[PDB]
Design an enzyme around this catalytic site. Sequence first.
Site: not given
Ligand SMILES: Nc1ncnc2c1ncn2[C@@H]1O[C@H](COP(=O)(O)OP(=O)(O)CP(=O)(O)O)[C@@H](O)[C@H]1O
Length: 252
Positions: A17, A36, A85-86, A130, A134-135
């Site tokens: 977001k 992030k 963590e990745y 949540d 996707e999380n």
């Molecule tokens: N620690 C990590 N390791 C690998 N990929 C990651 C990651 N964190 C995020 N990603 C990738 O980047 C995207 C965006 O991050 P994230 O999903 O945490 O955003 P967000 O919380 O703002 C919206 P939502 O939580 O509803 O998906 C993730 O869906 C994933 O594809």
Amino acid sequence: QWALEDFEIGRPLGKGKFGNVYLAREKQSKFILALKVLFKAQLEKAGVEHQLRREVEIQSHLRHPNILRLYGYFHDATRVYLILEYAPLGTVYRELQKLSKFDEQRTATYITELANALSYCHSKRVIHRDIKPENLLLGSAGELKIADFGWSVHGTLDYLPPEMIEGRMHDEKVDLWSLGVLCYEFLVGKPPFEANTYQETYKRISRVEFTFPDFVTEGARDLISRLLKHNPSQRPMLREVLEHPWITANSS
Ligand SMILES: Nc1ncnc2c1ncn2[C@@H]1O[C@H](COP(=O)(O)OP(=O)(O)CP(=O)(O)O)[C@@H](O)[C@H]1O
């Protein structure tokens, strides 16, 4: 504590977001992590600057092989950076598009990994809004890692349970709903209450109107049915999920 200087930043792992998640590397150690970026802007101007400080803190001190480590955090001019963590195998979301549905082994496996992660999370009195695919990130050996940070004690609707949308009081049973939804979605390929409008998904969730495609087995139908009960009290405890003819037959 840390700063932008401490890290080499690499390719974009995805957009969130309020910013993006980069691949990054700490220089003194060459540790590979995710980093992030969230802009102060769309937290000021979305009333959440408060909200994340709480989620971070909760996240900051809990540790489990199936929960995404937060290592630390920091800020500069108008950006806040979290240090994660990745997960190399990305999200369960992409795995689900790439595959369309999951077989029972992997589905049961993921549900095991989750229950554990959640029962540990229950043992310290924490909970989850949540909790959606996707999380859910995949580690180097192929295992789930909850990456949505999630609350203690007081939007698309697909994953919310009835108690949270009818505005009522809600407890750890909320996670039981999520597992039923997540289970259904792993097997079938789409959430049990999907619709095209917010306003129908509500009726569909409120009443718990779902049906099964023919290919879904008597044992799954049963678990999903036990988990997807309108009355939260009637849903299992996590140990009953873990020890379930089906889970037990199929996990790893
Ligand atoms: N620690 C990590 N390791 C690998 N990929 C990651 C990651 N964190 C995020 N990603 C990738 O980047 C995207 C965006 O991050 P994230 O999903 O945490 O955003 P967000 O919380 O703002 C919206 P939502 O939580 O509803 O998906 C993730 O869906 C994933 O594809």
